[PDB]
Design a protein around this nucleic acid. Structure first.
Length: 614
RNA sequence: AAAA
């Protein structure tokens, strides 16, 4: 009987799907071996145990092994190797090793909305097939995702907006959504069934929370589908209607929600997102090195790291039509840095062979002409990244950012010149213009004393003497809203003293304008941080839910939020995996760190960015 | 991490 060899990351669903594929084609497996990465949080840990429970019910013996142990000869005559799981770095390394007799190597690719996942066989023959039959059912998702999270559920009729064949469940403990499984993929679909729910305005708070909720319930590719409240729009003045709708659209883009017309089938809404983009031409051959080749996808930091490392004169960017906005912002970023940009669209996220065929000639020409060729392997789907790897030839320089350092695919690590990074550049790459409120503010000992003076005497009606020294030292005047400025300047000053020595960059507050307000921002070693400054723990508690989603969506997976109070009083801060809570005074012995004395301690309790592959 |  065949043996299943499988990279295992946070989500058990692609691992399970790959097992169903093997079982359908080859029958009962002798055993499964999982090369597992540590689960990123307790919920994923629980989902993984649910997966192992399912394997046990399936009569499938399994074991977990370190990744390196997967780079050895097979014991069984026939192995099926699934490379979808975990970091694409390991897919690349396993693909090198497992292209051998006695092995079938494949991926499962489910990143196009409303399609069934595909199997891409890479070895011994390139083949692709639709996984309509093997697609996970609602019940399979319930036992892998919902049961381990303690979510009760019951089957309900699916929303009419889905194509035929969808299955759905209501979660009585989770108001406001329906969990829909369609052709093997999960969707968290917004419903407001209570009378006049659809006639109310939609909030930034509810939209952001819905996106986080979708990701907790259904994982990384669970699409939050939100039919907008057209009845509310019809209740508006025509001008206000345009304003309201624009706000919803902006919020939905910001938190990763798929905002849809309730009057249309989802198939049409998805088609509109991908329509009219087909690229016709090959990529122009390179004229000037160095070159950077990269995919474009949700995380901007790896692409930015690649830019800092490679210092390219030409960049080649490939992605899918559904990532058109991100591609547009990446192109603008690189053009703004004087880099020649070439871009093309793939037919879809499965298009490994398109990436390979688009890039092979560019690589070959570059190597002929002696242009250094850098290839970043962080972005796109595993299919896309493997496509890029397969375009490479001896001499190419492939890397993968692992938190704060680049892993070199042929061995060794590159330290990134992070000291050359700027938070405003990262944000541009991501799709935002950071409009600073205090661009010329810099650290100044005397102005800091004043600010700190004010902070001791916060019982308020000196503030005029602060604003006057601000005018003097920075040339900035204000017309007769600045109450938060003393805390913001103090926080910025101590951040800057802590970070500058170490190559980090700190900034004061302003507006994140899509191409939301913050009290500060800093970038250090592959993690962006947004800062929120409040008089009390009370302002921070109220801000935390939205801040956590802003940090995640706009800052990225390794981003964090620094929450600083002048005075901490109440209970310990609420559980926040991506926020850090500090205070000038108070909160000793309730988890809250002391600012600025315990900065080092606070920023390294859970180091950002995380290294996954040490 | 199923598009670090």
């Amino acid at each position: 009987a065949p043996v299943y060899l499988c990279l295992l990351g946070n989500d058990p669903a692609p691992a399970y799907l790959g097992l169903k594929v093997v079982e359908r084609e080859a029958g009962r497996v002798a055993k499964a071996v999982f090369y597992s990465f540590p689960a990123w949080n307790e919920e994923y840990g629980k989902k993984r145990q649910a997966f192992f429970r399912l394997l046990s019910e399936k009569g499938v013996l399994y074991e977990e092994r370190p990744l390196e142990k997967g780079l050895e000869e097979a014991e069984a005559r026939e192995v099926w190797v699934n490379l979808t799981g975990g970091a694409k770095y390991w897919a690349v390394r396993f693909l090198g090793h497992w292209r051998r007799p006695g092995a079938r190597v494949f991926l499962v690719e489910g990143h196009r909305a409303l399609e069934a996942p595909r199997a891409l066989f890479l070895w011994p023959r390139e083949e692709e097939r639709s996984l309509e039959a093997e697609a996970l059912t609602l019940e399979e998702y319930a036992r892998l995702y919902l049961e381990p999270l303690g979510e009760a559920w019951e089957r309900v009729s699916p929303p009419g907006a889905f194509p035929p064949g969808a299955q759905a469940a209501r979660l009585p403990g989770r108001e406001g959504g329906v969990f829909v499984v369609h052709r093997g993929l999960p969707y968290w679909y917004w419903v407001r069934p209570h009378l006049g729910g659809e006639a109310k305005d939609m909030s930034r708070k509810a939209l952001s929370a819905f996106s986080g909720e979708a990701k907790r319930l259904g994982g990384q590719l669970c699409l939050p589908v939100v039919p907008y409240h057209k009845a509310h729009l019809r209740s508006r003045h025509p001008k206000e209607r345009e304003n309201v709708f624009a706000r919803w659209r902006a919020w939905a883009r910001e938190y990763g929600v798929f905002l849809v017309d309730p009057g249309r089938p989802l198939e049409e809404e998805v088609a509109s997102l991908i329509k009219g983009k087909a690229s016709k031409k090959a990529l122009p051959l390179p004229q000037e090195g160095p070159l950077l080749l990269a995919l474009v996808s949700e995380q901007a930091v790896p692409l930015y790291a690649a830019y800092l490392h490679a210092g390219p004169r030409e960049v080649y960017l490939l992605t899918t039509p559904e990532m058109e906005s991100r591609l547009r912002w990446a192109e603008a970023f690189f053009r703004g840095k004087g880099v020649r940009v070439h871009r093309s669209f793939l037919s879809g996220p499965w298009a490994l062979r398109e990436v390979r065929d688009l890039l092979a000639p560019v690589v070959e020409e570059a190597l002929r002409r002696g242009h250094p060729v850098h290839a970043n392997l962080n972005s796109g789907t595993t299919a896309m990244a493997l496509g890029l790897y397969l375009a490479l030839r001896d001499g190419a320089r492939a890397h993968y950012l692992d938190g704060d350092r680049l892993l070199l695919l042929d061995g060794g690590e590159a330290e990134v010149p992070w000291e050359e990074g700027r938070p405003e550049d990262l944000l541009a790459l991501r799709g935002y213009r950071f409009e600073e409120e205090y661009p010329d503010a810099r650290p100044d000992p005397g102005l800091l004393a004043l600010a700190e003076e004010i902070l001791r005497r916060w019982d308020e009606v000196l503030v005029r003497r602060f604003l006057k020294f601000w005018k003097k030292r920075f040339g900035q005047a204000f017309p007769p809203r600045l109450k938060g400025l003393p805390l913001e300047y103090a926080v910025y000053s101590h951040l800057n003293a802590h970070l500058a020595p170490k190559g980090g960059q700190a900034r004061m507050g302003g507006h994140l304008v899509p191409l939301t307000e913050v009290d500060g921002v800093f970038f250090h070693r592959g993690a962006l941080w947004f800062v929120e400054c409040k008089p009390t723990d009370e302002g921070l508690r109220e801000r935390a839910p939205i801040m956590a989603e802003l940090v995640r969506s706009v800052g990225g997976v390794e981003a964090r939020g620094l929450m600083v109070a002048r005075r901490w009083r109440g209970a310990p801060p609420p559980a926040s995996p991506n926020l850090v809570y500090m205070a000038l005074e108070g909160g000793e012995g309730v988890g809250v760190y002391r600012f600025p004395e315990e900065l080092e301690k606070a920023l390294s309790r859970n180091p950002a960015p995380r290294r996954g592959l040490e």
